[PDB]
């Protein structure tokens, strides 16, 4: 009989995992402040890692990797990519980015902007922050003055980045979209990619002449389910799953999802997680970690994949909660606490 | 030549002291009767080993040490043990009834009755020094004497020897071998009143020693004797520079100068390698790179914590055995490329290295195999504040209900001293976070 | 902290006290004439905690025998180990106490107490380092209950800085001598709340149920109940009598077990209890010692929570297995241990098993479910007191009705105080 | 990776390797607090003896 505690009441994913664990008859839930637990479903902020692994006789496991925020904060992700020789600052799959405080990279950002200015190249940049939750905190502009002035009005650090001006458009609708992949890293640092992804699409036609109507430019579910007068017009919930997307790629482009996009996604996931492996592995630590990640990708018109951001506390799509949650129990929980069929994950080496 | 005086307080301090001086005698070739055939200046001399041993006209080498316990059981073993001939009565002080795991008892009630006797017995060793440099004080956090009487002794030593250095070797409490539920109270009370009187303190977590003994020595249920033999090897690596010819850490002042830029943050983390089982008949000999890389495994640290999520303020490497400088630099260069080693911005990223050609000495018939080379690393990393956070949390759970507080008030302590001491640890936790986190 | 002074008072206190000395005298190799005939140095290392040494290498219990009538103490002096006690240490009168707390505490007992205190004073003065005192008695009668608590009040006045410890037998209508036992017990609990550091609550209702249900004895006697009390007392004093690290003296024990001065009433347990030659595995020992059916206070621990727990394992066994088994009990039932006292379960092992067993285990618990015992007593008390039934036996000895009212208030406060920490 | 201050002797040697540069209460007061605690201890005991005398 295994024991666990819950410290993030607002997690949709682990509310389900907590539910499955109980329905097995072999996991007992404890009061949230009881220390004699086998499994901690921890809080988002200030998780007390320093108090784990000191209970004699208990093997202790937590659903977060200490130090993984370097990947899951827009500011620090830029730094991790620029200064990591394993990523080279020249890796071809991350847009040109700069960190800008209201240290700072203001001077270098302006330098690349002039080069593009004289070069006549697409000079549309997007500014965003970490506290930017639910469609607010972004500005898309082709004039740097409006960008920096928008940042100096906010007290939080921000990031300026190339706005991908040539995105891949679905037809009909001429509409933007983005790909969410769910990735599970277990205590051994095996990397498991959930076979099911999802596209979060814009129900409005992409209009590259007005970056002010941030509707056909932002793929967020919250913005499309409120501002876009065409919500649910094409797919149920502006969510298209991989079978349809694949069939579309076969019908429209004479290719498949695996060849044109998945090889690159798998490459990007491995690079990011292998880079920080020596800093966050718990292979010889007194407690163990696993964590579910949400990778967000862009696809351009040349079928090139771009990494947008990594989410450390992601939620799932409605119809995918069941299958994926059982997989967390199987691969990441029962692997450490065994209980008494083709996999739903792809293992990346 | 400058002398050093060792002071051992409470059961933990006395038993570890016994283990250390046994090791010293083996290292310096001093028989249990005190004679030393290699010493050719009879009855005197100012060699390196004379910083820990004085000499009688009969050629006996006597440790510059003092043993203090508020109960006589543990010091009586010293009085009748293998090295009974080493010390003389004046160096062994014992009371009648102990502190009952009650800091207030060891500090106020009982300490007040013995402090002058202890100080006067210490004054006798001091008077026999031509240039005393300070004290090394061994004790536990959790016992009533080790915590309560030690803190009183440190206050008085600062008054009577204001210009002298004071170093601590402290045992941090672990439930797997602990004897009292109130050990968190005592730990925090003694860290509060002792902080400003200690220049450098080395914490040993019994949990960490316990696990090393089960893992690397294959001991089912380690005992204090197992633990103390391993602790003595580490203590010996740290004091070896005071006892042998050398150029690094040759006086107590150099420990502060080399490991402690900020006075309050004076708790360096110690890591030791290799620990090899002696029943292991055939074992491969580890290289300089292998034992140096092991200094960055949490499993070999005296306090479990993750230095990858902290910052370094200083770092010393102390080798014993077949080790030359170029093998060390070759090992360090390789480790830099594979490890997360972050220093604070206002400190150099470097290492101070000392090599002593004599390989570690091991008590015959003990648990540790003899190796061709070993290393002890001392690093001042903010990650050690994880141990303060564990301790403070346990204190918070009990004090919110005032559990056990009546035992302390009964001895004369006011309830205010509790929060006074808990507010100081709160500041100390904040000092570590300012120094090490972004 | 070496010498303990033992005191036994009244019929129950002396009948249990005598069995205790037979059992532990056997463990330390002391024969009925005070000669030592052991074969292990472990037997003599801490023999001074309970025994004085006389000429010719004789050992004399540091025990004082008290009663207001001679009956039960003549039987002790004629018992198996009767001749081992110091003759001067028998102190007794003739009137008896008629199962009346007021006679023991205020009239008959008052006349005799100064003689007891003279003998106590004589044993304490020869002590190198007196730890404190332990008293055996029942709460349902007159001498052990009324004079016992008077003794404790006066020892404290003379030795305020020593530990005071009792084994107290609680009455039950199922093993009852008179209808006034709830009056006597209620008056006594008030004294113990103020004047003892540790009290082991031994409930005659539990001893009876264990003899009937588990040991399969159709018609238990007091002798059968006292065999259980002997085994328990030997168990809970093991840490005082043999070399060891944990709870090795009375004051360190009280620091580990008592988080609030008034909540110092302990629930003891013992394993195994069998109706004999089969070996008991360490898992088996651990599951039985924690089972309510092995508890001596007739309280369901699943009805409250544990403040602190002390366990002792005796015999040659795997210390690794003992640690694993104890960690498994806490980990698999963490609901019943308070979370605001970290690591509140301590465990000791001694290599010398008790007579007749290869291994055994003894349990000492500070549980909030002990309030069920005081609620029992409080109900029985009030049922009579609301009609002032049987009070004339007490007002005839000079007591007033208000005193009873206060004793009742104090105990209902004690029950409220336990309920306070069961919900914290 | 600069090595500095290499000192050699018959029993060993020491040196330093640098990888990157940077970027009390009086005795009287002690006696007061100790005697303050002893006084509170004496007051608590006088209260017990008074209570027992009642
Ligand atoms: N490593 C190690 N720890 C010990 C040793 N002896 C005791 N301890 C630890 O020290 C703590 C108990 O403190 P003690 O030193 O035994 O107590 P004390 O200083 O004698 O003070 P008193 O309360 O008067 O007995 C516990 O955490 C023990 O685990 C020892 O020999 N080696
Ligand atoms: N560099 C870029 N080029 C083109 N489009 C971009 C872009 N960066 C972001 N976008 C689009 O704008 C949106 C900005 O969202 P952002 O990157 O802030 O995620 P978010 O934190 O607000 C919600 P989530 O946690 O699910 O990622 C993206 O969903 C994407 O559609
Ligand atoms: N367990 C046990 N209980 C006893 C024994 N003798 C008496 N009692 C109980 O003791 C209580 C009080 O009686 P007692 O001690 O004999 O009166 P006293 O002589 O005035 O102290 C009653 O509840 C009895 O049930 C005994 O030998 N063993
Ligand atoms: Ca000499
Ligand atoms: Ca009379
Ligand atoms: Mg986000
Ligand atoms: Mg002690
Ligand atoms: Mg009777």
mmCIF file of N, CA, C and O in Angstrom, chain B residues 11 15 96-102 105 175-183 210 214 220-221 224 393-394 397-399 401-407 411, chain C residues 1 128-130 161-163 197 245-247 249 251-252 254-261 308 319-320 323 327 339-346 421 424:
data_model
loop_
_atom_site.group_PDB
_atom_site.id
_atom_site.type_symbol
_atom_site.label_atom_id
_atom_site.label_comp_id
_atom_site.label_asym_id
_atom_site.label_seq_id
_atom_site.Cartn_x
_atom_site.Cartn_y
_atom_site.Cartn_z
ATOM 1 N N UNK B 11 28.768 13.107 25.145
ATOM 2 C CA UNK B 11 29.068 11.752 24.685
ATOM 3 C C UNK B 11 29.627 11.759 23.264
ATOM 4 O O UNK B 11 30.673 11.157 22.989
ATOM 5 N N UNK B 15 33.536 10.542 22.466
ATOM 6 C CA UNK B 15 33.774 9.306 21.725
ATOM 7 C C UNK B 15 34.483 9.576 20.405
ATOM 8 O O UNK B 15 35.400 8.835 20.025
ATOM 9 N N UNK B 96 28.087 14.623 37.646
ATOM 10 C CA UNK B 96 27.347 13.520 38.249
ATOM 11 C C UNK B 96 26.062 13.180 37.507
ATOM 12 O O UNK B 96 25.819 12.005 37.212
ATOM 13 N N UNK B 97 25.223 14.169 37.205
ATOM 14 C CA UNK B 97 23.997 13.955 36.449
ATOM 15 C C UNK B 97 23.988 14.874 35.236
ATOM 16 O O UNK B 97 24.456 16.015 35.306
ATOM 17 N N UNK B 98 23.449 14.375 34.127
ATOM 18 C CA UNK B 98 23.623 15.033 32.840
ATOM 19 C C UNK B 98 22.465 15.997 32.567
ATOM 20 O O UNK B 98 21.630 16.268 33.433
ATOM 21 N N UNK B 99 22.414 16.523 31.346
ATOM 22 C CA UNK B 99 21.463 17.551 30.939
ATOM 23 C C UNK B 99 20.131 16.993 30.436
ATOM 24 O O UNK B 99 19.240 17.779 30.095
ATOM 25 N N UNK B 100 19.979 15.668 30.368
ATOM 26 C CA UNK B 100 18.707 15.016 30.021
ATOM 27 C C UNK B 100 18.157 15.496 28.675
ATOM 28 O O UNK B 100 16.949 15.668 28.497
ATOM 29 N N UNK B 101 19.051 15.709 27.714
ATOM 30 C CA UNK B 101 18.665 16.177 26.386
ATOM 31 C C UNK B 101 17.947 17.524 26.446
ATOM 32 O O UNK B 101 17.109 17.831 25.596
ATOM 33 N N UNK B 102 18.283 18.345 27.436
ATOM 34 C CA UNK B 102 17.603 19.612 27.700
ATOM 35 C C UNK B 102 18.638 20.737 27.651
ATOM 36 O O UNK B 102 19.403 20.928 28.604
ATOM 37 N N UNK B 105 19.039 22.915 30.597
ATOM 38 C CA UNK B 105 19.704 22.270 31.723
ATOM 39 C C UNK B 105 21.217 22.350 31.571
ATOM 40 O O UNK B 105 21.933 22.639 32.537
ATOM 41 N N UNK B 175 17.268 11.070 12.803
ATOM 42 C CA UNK B 175 16.363 10.117 13.474
ATOM 43 C C UNK B 175 16.827 8.669 13.463
ATOM 44 O O UNK B 175 16.475 7.925 14.384
ATOM 45 N N UNK B 176 17.577 8.223 12.455
ATOM 46 C CA UNK B 176 17.921 6.804 12.405
ATOM 47 C C UNK B 176 18.821 6.368 13.559
ATOM 48 O O UNK B 176 18.898 5.166 13.838
ATOM 49 N N UNK B 177 19.499 7.299 14.238
ATOM 50 C CA UNK B 177 20.315 6.934 15.393
ATOM 51 C C UNK B 177 20.165 7.953 16.520
ATOM 52 O O UNK B 177 21.066 8.104 17.353
ATOM 53 N N UNK B 178 19.032 8.645 16.567
ATOM 54 C CA UNK B 178 18.858 9.721 17.528
ATOM 55 C C UNK B 178 18.109 9.222 18.752
ATOM 56 O O UNK B 178 17.341 8.260 18.697
ATOM 57 N N UNK B 179 18.326 9.916 19.864
ATOM 58 C CA UNK B 179 17.851 9.475 21.166
ATOM 59 C C UNK B 179 16.804 10.394 21.778
ATOM 60 O O UNK B 179 16.358 10.134 22.902
ATOM 61 N N UNK B 180 16.389 11.454 21.086
ATOM 62 C CA UNK B 180 15.492 12.424 21.697
ATOM 63 C C UNK B 180 14.621 13.093 20.644
ATOM 64 O O UNK B 180 15.082 13.404 19.542
ATOM 65 N N UNK B 181 13.363 13.334 21.012
ATOM 66 C CA UNK B 181 12.440 14.038 20.131
ATOM 67 C C UNK B 181 12.691 15.545 20.073
ATOM 68 O O UNK B 181 12.280 16.187 19.098
ATOM 69 N N UNK B 182 13.358 16.134 21.074
ATOM 70 C CA UNK B 182 13.544 17.586 21.124
ATOM 71 C C UNK B 182 14.870 18.041 20.517
ATOM 72 O O UNK B 182 15.249 19.216 20.638
ATOM 73 N N UNK B 183 15.585 17.134 19.859
ATOM 74 C CA UNK B 183 16.859 17.523 19.271
ATOM 75 C C UNK B 183 16.750 18.751 18.371
ATOM 76 O O UNK B 183 17.710 19.541 18.349
ATOM 77 N N UNK B 210 25.766 7.388 8.325
ATOM 78 C CA UNK B 210 25.065 6.114 8.443
ATOM 79 C C UNK B 210 24.918 5.437 7.088
ATOM 80 O O UNK B 210 25.174 4.236 6.950
ATOM 81 N N UNK B 214 26.518 1.861 5.348
ATOM 82 C CA UNK B 214 25.748 0.747 4.797
ATOM 83 C C UNK B 214 26.107 0.484 3.339
ATOM 84 O O UNK B 214 26.196 -0.673 2.914
ATOM 85 N N UNK B 220 25.311 -3.881 7.873
ATOM 86 C CA UNK B 220 23.858 -3.983 7.982
ATOM 87 C C UNK B 220 23.284 -2.862 8.848
ATOM 88 O O UNK B 220 22.416 -2.098 8.408
ATOM 89 N N UNK B 221 23.749 -2.755 10.091
ATOM 90 C CA UNK B 221 23.250 -1.756 11.034
ATOM 91 C C UNK B 221 24.453 -1.092 11.684
ATOM 92 O O UNK B 221 24.966 -1.569 12.706
ATOM 93 N N UNK B 224 27.929 3.336 16.553
ATOM 94 C CA UNK B 224 28.720 4.538 16.807
ATOM 95 C C UNK B 224 30.195 4.297 16.515
ATOM 96 O O UNK B 224 30.880 5.181 15.982
ATOM 97 N N UNK B 393 12.080 23.625 10.049
ATOM 98 C CA UNK B 393 10.704 23.183 9.845
ATOM 99 C C UNK B 393 10.236 22.291 10.988
ATOM 100 O O UNK B 393 9.108 22.435 11.473
ATOM 101 N N UNK B 394 11.078 21.350 11.418
ATOM 102 C CA UNK B 394 10.710 20.498 12.545
ATOM 103 C C UNK B 394 10.477 21.331 13.798
ATOM 104 O O UNK B 394 9.499 21.119 14.529
ATOM 105 N N UNK B 397 6.946 23.005 13.572
ATOM 106 C CA UNK B 397 5.810 22.124 13.833
ATOM 107 C C UNK B 397 5.538 21.978 15.327
ATOM 108 O O UNK B 397 4.378 22.029 15.764
ATOM 109 N N UNK B 398 6.594 21.784 16.125
ATOM 110 C CA UNK B 398 6.435 21.556 17.557
ATOM 111 C C UNK B 398 6.135 22.851 18.298
ATOM 112 O O UNK B 398 5.244 22.883 19.153
ATOM 113 N N UNK B 399 6.850 23.929 17.977
ATOM 114 C CA UNK B 399 6.675 25.163 18.735
ATOM 115 C C UNK B 399 5.300 25.789 18.532
ATOM 116 O O UNK B 399 4.832 26.507 19.424
ATOM 117 N N UNK B 401 2.535 24.444 18.807
ATOM 118 C CA UNK B 401 1.726 23.920 19.896
ATOM 119 C C UNK B 401 2.429 24.035 21.238
ATOM 120 O O UNK B 401 1.908 23.546 22.241
ATOM 121 N N UNK B 402 3.606 24.656 21.277
ATOM 122 C CA UNK B 402 4.394 24.768 22.503
ATOM 123 C C UNK B 402 4.740 23.401 23.078
ATOM 124 O O UNK B 402 4.954 23.259 24.283
ATOM 125 N N UNK B 403 4.808 22.387 22.225
ATOM 126 C CA UNK B 403 5.120 21.049 22.702
ATOM 127 C C UNK B 403 6.505 21.024 23.336
ATOM 128 O O UNK B 403 7.479 21.507 22.751
ATOM 129 N N UNK B 404 6.581 20.466 24.545
ATOM 130 C CA UNK B 404 7.801 20.264 25.322
ATOM 131 C C UNK B 404 8.392 21.560 25.876
ATOM 132 O O UNK B 404 9.366 21.496 26.639
ATOM 133 N N UNK B 405 7.830 22.730 25.547
ATOM 134 C CA UNK B 405 8.438 23.996 25.963
ATOM 135 C C UNK B 405 8.525 24.093 27.484
ATOM 136 O O UNK B 405 9.403 24.782 28.023
ATOM 137 N N UNK B 406 7.624 23.416 28.201
ATOM 138 C CA UNK B 406 7.587 23.557 29.656
ATOM 139 C C UNK B 406 8.849 22.999 30.309
ATOM 140 O O UNK B 406 9.250 23.463 31.382
ATOM 141 N N UNK B 407 9.507 22.035 29.663
ATOM 142 C CA UNK B 407 10.750 21.490 30.203
ATOM 143 C C UNK B 407 11.851 22.547 30.267
ATOM 144 O O UNK B 407 12.710 22.511 31.158
ATOM 145 N N UNK B 411 13.595 25.145 33.767
ATOM 146 C CA UNK B 411 14.999 25.267 34.131
ATOM 147 C C UNK B 411 15.447 26.717 34.257
ATOM 148 O O UNK B 411 16.609 26.966 34.589
ATOM 149 N N UNK C 1 22.600 9.974 37.861
ATOM 150 C CA UNK C 1 21.323 9.312 37.621
ATOM 151 C C UNK C 1 21.483 7.795 37.597
ATOM 152 O O UNK C 1 21.571 7.182 36.528
ATOM 153 N N UNK C 128 24.187 7.606 45.555
ATOM 154 C CA UNK C 128 25.202 8.405 44.884
ATOM 155 C C UNK C 128 24.566 9.485 44.017
ATOM 156 O O UNK C 128 25.053 10.621 43.969
ATOM 157 N N UNK C 129 23.476 9.151 43.322
ATOM 158 C CA UNK C 129 22.819 10.115 42.437
ATOM 159 C C UNK C 129 21.382 9.632 42.211
ATOM 160 O O UNK C 129 21.103 8.910 41.254
ATOM 161 N N UNK C 130 20.483 10.060 43.094
ATOM 162 C CA UNK C 130 19.103 9.589 43.088
ATOM 163 C C UNK C 130 18.363 10.068 41.840
ATOM 164 O O UNK C 130 18.252 11.274 41.604
ATOM 165 N N UNK C 161 13.017 18.235 42.979
ATOM 166 C CA UNK C 161 13.802 18.122 41.757
ATOM 167 C C UNK C 161 14.096 16.675 41.376
ATOM 168 O O UNK C 161 15.077 16.414 40.675
ATOM 169 N N UNK C 162 13.282 15.729 41.828
ATOM 170 C CA UNK C 162 13.429 14.336 41.438
ATOM 171 C C UNK C 162 12.191 13.897 40.667
ATOM 172 O O UNK C 162 11.113 14.482 40.813
ATOM 173 N N UNK C 163 12.360 12.869 39.831
ATOM 174 C CA UNK C 163 11.277 12.373 38.990
ATOM 175 C C UNK C 163 10.352 11.492 39.817
ATOM 176 O O UNK C 163 10.813 10.696 40.643
ATOM 177 N N UNK C 197 5.302 12.661 37.143
ATOM 178 C CA UNK C 197 5.871 12.936 35.829
ATOM 179 C C UNK C 197 5.440 11.902 34.796
ATOM 180 O O UNK C 197 5.282 12.244 33.622
ATOM 181 N N UNK C 245 21.267 3.034 24.907
ATOM 182 C CA UNK C 245 21.328 4.438 24.506
ATOM 183 C C UNK C 245 20.059 5.228 24.829
ATOM 184 O O UNK C 245 20.139 6.379 25.279
ATOM 185 N N UNK C 246 18.890 4.636 24.601
ATOM 186 C CA UNK C 246 17.637 5.377 24.563
ATOM 187 C C UNK C 246 16.822 5.193 25.837
ATOM 188 O O UNK C 246 16.701 4.078 26.350
ATOM 189 N N UNK C 247 16.212 6.287 26.303
ATOM 190 C CA UNK C 247 15.331 6.281 27.479
ATOM 191 C C UNK C 247 15.965 5.522 28.644
ATOM 192 O O UNK C 247 15.319 4.736 29.342
ATOM 193 N N UNK C 249 17.174 6.604 31.486
ATOM 194 C CA UNK C 249 16.851 7.048 32.840
ATOM 195 C C UNK C 249 15.505 7.762 32.843
ATOM 196 O O UNK C 249 14.956 8.112 31.795
ATOM 197 N N UNK C 251 14.382 10.748 33.676
ATOM 198 C CA UNK C 251 14.164 12.119 33.218
ATOM 199 C C UNK C 251 14.255 12.220 31.701
ATOM 200 O O UNK C 251 13.458 12.932 31.077
ATOM 201 N N UNK C 252 15.218 11.523 31.091
ATOM 202 C CA UNK C 252 15.275 11.471 29.634
ATOM 203 C C UNK C 252 14.026 10.814 29.057
ATOM 204 O O UNK C 252 13.537 11.218 27.995
ATOM 205 N N UNK C 254 11.003 11.001 30.424
ATOM 206 C CA UNK C 254 9.902 11.945 30.563
ATOM 207 C C UNK C 254 10.020 13.084 29.556
ATOM 208 O O UNK C 254 9.003 13.614 29.093
ATOM 209 N N UNK C 255 11.246 13.461 29.196
ATOM 210 C CA UNK C 255 11.433 14.483 28.176
ATOM 211 C C UNK C 255 10.966 13.981 26.813
ATOM 212 O O UNK C 255 10.349 14.727 26.046
ATOM 213 N N UNK C 256 11.233 12.710 26.494
ATOM 214 C CA UNK C 256 10.813 12.145 25.211
ATOM 215 C C UNK C 256 9.316 11.828 25.131
ATOM 216 O O UNK C 256 8.770 11.802 24.022
ATOM 217 N N UNK C 257 8.639 11.580 26.262
ATOM 218 C CA UNK C 257 7.268 11.077 26.236
ATOM 219 C C UNK C 257 6.200 12.099 26.610
ATOM 220 O O UNK C 257 5.026 11.871 26.298
ATOM 221 N N UNK C 258 6.555 13.200 27.270
ATOM 222 C CA UNK C 258 5.547 14.089 27.854
ATOM 223 C C UNK C 258 5.611 15.491 27.251
ATOM 224 O O UNK C 258 6.348 16.343 27.762
ATOM 225 N N UNK C 259 4.836 15.791 26.205
ATOM 226 C CA UNK C 259 4.913 17.124 25.588
ATOM 227 C C UNK C 259 4.154 18.213 26.336
ATOM 228 O O UNK C 259 4.329 19.395 26.011
ATOM 229 N N UNK C 260 3.327 17.867 27.325
ATOM 230 C CA UNK C 260 2.563 18.857 28.076
ATOM 231 C C UNK C 260 2.445 18.309 29.486
ATOM 232 O O UNK C 260 2.183 17.111 29.647
ATOM 233 N N UNK C 261 2.629 19.139 30.515
ATOM 234 C CA UNK C 261 2.827 18.587 31.866
ATOM 235 C C UNK C 261 1.692 17.707 32.352
ATOM 236 O O UNK C 261 1.950 16.738 33.078
ATOM 237 N N UNK C 308 3.254 10.299 21.479
ATOM 238 C CA UNK C 308 4.594 9.727 21.487
ATOM 239 C C UNK C 308 4.483 8.232 21.750
ATOM 240 O O UNK C 308 3.503 7.755 22.330
ATOM 241 N N UNK C 319 18.424 -6.651 14.027
ATOM 242 C CA UNK C 319 18.167 -5.237 14.268
ATOM 243 C C UNK C 319 17.759 -4.526 12.984
ATOM 244 O O UNK C 319 16.982 -3.566 13.026
ATOM 245 N N UNK C 320 18.275 -4.981 11.841
ATOM 246 C CA UNK C 320 17.802 -4.481 10.555
ATOM 247 C C UNK C 320 16.307 -4.740 10.388
ATOM 248 O O UNK C 320 15.537 -3.832 10.050
ATOM 249 N N UNK C 323 14.161 -2.368 12.629
ATOM 250 C CA UNK C 323 13.991 -1.019 12.092
ATOM 251 C C UNK C 323 12.996 -1.018 10.940
ATOM 252 O O UNK C 323 12.094 -0.173 10.887
ATOM 253 N N UNK C 327 9.409 1.086 11.035
ATOM 254 C CA UNK C 327 9.116 2.069 10.000
ATOM 255 C C UNK C 327 7.875 1.681 9.201
ATOM 256 O O UNK C 327 7.110 2.554 8.777
ATOM 257 N N UNK C 339 1.113 14.803 13.557
ATOM 258 C CA UNK C 339 2.126 15.260 12.618
ATOM 259 C C UNK C 339 2.953 16.428 13.140
ATOM 260 O O UNK C 339 3.982 16.751 12.535
ATOM 261 N N UNK C 340 2.551 17.060 14.241
ATOM 262 C CA UNK C 340 3.288 18.194 14.783
ATOM 263 C C UNK C 340 4.309 17.788 15.843
ATOM 264 O O UNK C 340 4.785 18.652 16.591
ATOM 265 N N UNK C 341 4.641 16.501 15.933
ATOM 266 C CA UNK C 341 5.784 16.017 16.707
ATOM 267 C C UNK C 341 6.570 15.071 15.803
ATOM 268 O O UNK C 341 6.262 13.873 15.733
ATOM 269 N N UNK C 342 7.565 15.565 15.073
ATOM 270 C CA UNK C 342 8.289 14.700 14.131
ATOM 271 C C UNK C 342 9.032 13.572 14.839
ATOM 272 O O UNK C 342 9.601 13.757 15.917
ATOM 273 N N UNK C 343 9.026 12.394 14.216
ATOM 274 C CA UNK C 343 9.802 11.248 14.685
ATOM 275 C C UNK C 343 9.504 10.939 16.147
ATOM 276 O O UNK C 343 10.407 10.783 16.972
ATOM 277 N N UNK C 344 8.214 10.837 16.462
ATOM 278 C CA UNK C 344 7.735 10.640 17.826
ATOM 279 C C UNK C 344 7.705 9.168 18.253
ATOM 280 O O UNK C 344 7.152 8.856 19.314
ATOM 281 N N UNK C 345 8.290 8.265 17.465
ATOM 282 C CA UNK C 345 8.375 6.844 17.791
ATOM 283 C C UNK C 345 9.847 6.480 17.931
ATOM 284 O O UNK C 345 10.620 6.624 16.975
ATOM 285 N N UNK C 346 10.231 6.010 19.116
ATOM 286 C CA UNK C 346 11.596 5.594 19.401
ATOM 287 C C UNK C 346 11.625 4.112 19.747
ATOM 288 O O UNK C 346 10.688 3.583 20.353
ATOM 289 N N UNK C 421 -6.191 18.124 21.787
ATOM 290 C CA UNK C 421 -5.054 17.736 20.959
ATOM 291 C C UNK C 421 -5.372 16.610 19.990
ATOM 292 O O UNK C 421 -4.560 16.337 19.100
ATOM 293 N N UNK C 424 -6.298 18.848 16.970
ATOM 294 C CA UNK C 424 -5.325 19.858 16.562
ATOM 295 C C UNK C 424 -4.745 19.568 15.179
ATOM 296 O O UNK C 424 -4.126 18.526 14.958
#
